RNA sequence: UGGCGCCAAGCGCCCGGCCCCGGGGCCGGGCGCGACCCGCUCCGGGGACAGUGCCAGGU
RNA sequence: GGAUUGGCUCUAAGGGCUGGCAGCCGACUUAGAACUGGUGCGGACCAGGGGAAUCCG
RNA sequence: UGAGCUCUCGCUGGCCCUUGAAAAUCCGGGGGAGAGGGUGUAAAUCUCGCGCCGGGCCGUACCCAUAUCCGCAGCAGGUC
RNA sequence: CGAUGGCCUCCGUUGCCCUCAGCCGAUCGAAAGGGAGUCGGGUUCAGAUCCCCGAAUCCGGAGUGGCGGAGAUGGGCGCCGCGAGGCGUCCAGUGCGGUAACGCGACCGAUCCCGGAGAAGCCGGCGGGAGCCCCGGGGAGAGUUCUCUUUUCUUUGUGAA
């Protein structure tokens, strides 16, 4: 697993051809975006909430999204 | 207290059957088999008893997958000889060269006098 | 008296540049504030010219006889002085202790040192200074 | 003095290809000194004795 | 070759951290004393009999 | 919180008329034979990051001991 | 030198010549010696580091290498342009920093040579880190409650990389 700490490189890895699916985990005080690539699983952690759901529509349309309920 | 067993078929406490305790997410104590401890390379001087700095101390076949900088230090003879012995070698080479030069010039002077 | 003058040839004794031959361009026998130890700014050659010979074309001669130089300030304990000296002129304004505050004009200083080293080496004088030390 | 040392320098004599103006330039090869010559055992040490084969006597 | 050994209630000594002192924490020890039991206290378990000599190695 | 027990890492010392393995495999260095390009769409070359494909054959159950082993046996023995 | 295939480019495949050079001896010999690299959760009547789920990792391979990044893009002169920036000639460019221990994401290189790791006894003392045990509390569930007991017991976590 690899943690992504700045905002934009997460989208950069998300738009790679290798990426399979992104799953959204919504626990208290954190929001985790997990993108599954061939080699690693990249996790981006957002502390607040508003960045999270204004990014939720910024993922590429062709990439599968799964909300963990 | 949970007494625990081996996980391989080797039931003897040899040098390769070395384990350590670990707590799994399942809240249990299990054996994890440990790799043998590596050694940093020894200096090519043959006198300094310590081991070289700046080089990872891992088993020899793990060197195949390390990067070049992790296996050596950027200096002449770096990664195989210690800095103190490098300095001594440098001084020795220069001084023997100077000694040879002065000996040859003295021989030339003696021949000229002869 | 003092022998380590601003024209001396010095065998560098430590660091990445070990075993190289340099020329002192400005010595300071009394440590300054940022450097209490006595030191000196020197210009050396990192890549000695290759062993050139006859029976090869001058394009190959020029390709082989090319120097890579470095400019650095060294502690006196890391410098071994010799009895040799080279009268090669180095421009004080370009090559000075102020060269280390940026990486722009350090390239200029190395450029000037390399050019001067090449034009002196081509003459054949001070040939000892241009052969690597075998150690 | 707890250093380095190989895979020729140099010199001499030939040759090829390309270009420029028989000459010059450019590129690329060969041979020989450097590293002397001639010889019939690789060097030493023993040697017609050690040793071996077959007989004879002693133990 | 001698003496003691239980239980209970105490006393004294042996330290750390923070700001000759003050405060806050603390781990097992050792010694001494009183009281007390139908003289019993290494109460089960664990746990060397001893001495004087001779022969041999 | 602990001279508590076990494992492990490390430092240091003692003993030897005892000095207490080899090879496979891997790595660093010294050298500098070679290669690249003529100022760019730069080239040769990269032990850096990511990406693509594959990893064949054999063993794998259970007992491991006052009843699955050897003692003629469901043997008070023996067995790392 | 000779021939072939692929846009006969550049390389591959050979066949011949020149050149280069040791073996410690074929081979066998360890399911406890050396030996790269997998862990957690779930699942069966009987199998799990092997099945499923999820996270990894080692080795090997690839005409066109699939791609980024490094090698890398600077200086001088004559200029244009107010400048910014843009032209025409030369010159460099197989990385850089720290006094040093050394550091940085890579940072050309063959035959040859040197070295290291593999690769080391027994015992003693001490220290560090884990697992276990122990003490004071918060929870959750149980046991005793003739009298007492803020009580007694169980449980209270995180893999590899
Ligand atoms: Mg084994
Ligand atoms: Mg008697
Ligand atoms: Mg006896
Ligand atoms: Mg089994
Ligand atoms: Mg074998
Ligand atoms: Mg084996
Ligand atoms: Mg853990
Ligand atoms: Zn040394």
User: Resolution reached, in Å?
Assistant: 2.9
Radius of gyration for chain B, computed over Cα atoms and rounded to the nearest angstrom: 27
SS3 per-residue string spanning B66-100: CCCHHHCCCCCCCCCCCHHHHHHHHHHHHHHHHHH
CB spacing of C18 vs B75 below 8 angstroms: yes
List chain D nucleotides near protein: any atom < 7 Å from a Cβ: 1-5, 9-11, 26-28
Phi/psi of residue C73, each to 5°? -100, 130
Q: Is B103 within 7 A of strand G by CB distance?
A: no
Regarding beta strands A30-36 and A41-46, do their DSSP bridges make them parallel or antiparallel, or are they unpaired?
Answer: antiparallel
> Which chain B residues in 22-81 sit with Cβ < 7 A of strand G?
22-30, 32-33, 35-36, 38-39, 41-42, 44, 46, 52-54, 59-65, 67-70, 73-75, 78, 80
Regarding beta strands A41-46 and A2-4, do their DSSP bridges make them parallel or antiparallel, or are they unpaired?
Answer: parallel
From chain B, the residues in CB contact with C135 under 8 A are 89-90, 92-94
Residue from A37, A38, A36, A33 nearest A7 by CA: A33
**Number of alpha carbons in the 13 Å side-chain half-sphere of residue C86:** 25
Asked whether the beta carbons of C117 and C67 are under 8 A apart, the reply is yes
Regarding beta strands A21-27 and A30-36, do their DSSP bridges make them parallel or antiparallel, or are they unpaired?
Answer: antiparallel
Tokens representing residue B58 in the block:
């891992």
List, in order, residues 6 or more apart from A19 with CB less than 8 Å away: A13, A35, A36, A37, A63
CB spacing of B94 vs C133 below 8 angstroms: yes
Collapsing DSSP to helix, strand or coil, C80 comes out as strand
Q: How many CB pairs under 8 A join B and C?
A: 32
Q: Is B42 within 7 A of strand F by CB distance?
A: no
> Experimental method for this entry?
cryo-EM
Ligand 1 centroid, distance to B16 Cα (angstroms)? 7
Interface mutation vs chain C, best among B54, B74, B76, B91, most C CBs within 10 Å:
B76
From chain C, the residues in CB contact with B90 under 8 A are 11, 13, 18-19, 80, 133, 135
Q: How far apart are CA A67 and CA C22, in angstroms?
A: 66
DSSP C48: P
Give the start-end residues of each E strand in C4-125. Answer: 8-12, 21-28, 39-47, 68-75, 79-85
């Amino acid at each position: 697993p690899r943690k992504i700490e700045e905002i934009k490189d997460f989208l950069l890895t998300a738009r790679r051809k290798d990426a399979k699916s992104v799953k959204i985990k919504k626990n208290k005080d954190n929001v985790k975006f997990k993108v599954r690539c061939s080699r690693y699983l990249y996790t981006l952690v957002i502390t607040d909430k508003e960045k999270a759901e204004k990014l939720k529509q910024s993922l590429p349309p062709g990439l599968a999204v799964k909300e963990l309920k | 207290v949970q007494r625990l067993t081996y996980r391989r078929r080797l039931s003897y406490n040899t040098a390769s059957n070395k384990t350590r305790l670990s707590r799994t997410p399942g809240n249990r104590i299990v054996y994890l088999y440990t790799k043998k401890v590596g050694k940093a390379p020894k200096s090519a001087c043959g006198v300094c008893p310590g081991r070289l700095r700046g080089v990872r101390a891992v088993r020899p076949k793990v060197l195949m997958r390390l990067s070049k900088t992790k296996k050596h230090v950027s200096r002449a003879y770096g990664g195989s000889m210690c800095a103190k012995c490098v300095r001594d070698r440098i001084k020795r080479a220069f001084l023997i060269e100077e000694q040879k030069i002065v000996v040859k010039v003295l021989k030339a002077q003696a021949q000229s006098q002869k | 008296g003092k022998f380590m003058k601003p024209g001396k040839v010095v065998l560098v004794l430590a660091g990445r540049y070990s075993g190289r031959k340099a020329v002192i361009v400005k010595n300071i026998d009394d440590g300054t504030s940022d450097r209490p130890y006595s030191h000196a700014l020197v210009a050396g050659i990192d890549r000695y010219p290759r062993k050139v010979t006859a029976a090869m074309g001058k394009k190959k001669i020029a390709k082989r006889s090319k120097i890579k130089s470095f400019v650095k300030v060294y502690n006196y304990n890391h410098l071994m002085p010799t009895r040799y000296s080279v009268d090669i002129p180095l421009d004080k304004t370009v090559v000075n202790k102020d060269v280390f505050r940026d990486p722009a004009l350090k390239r200029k200083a190395r450029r000037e040192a390399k050019v001067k080293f090449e034009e002196r080496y081509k003459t054949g004088k001070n040939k000892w200074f241009f052969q690597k030390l075998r150690f």
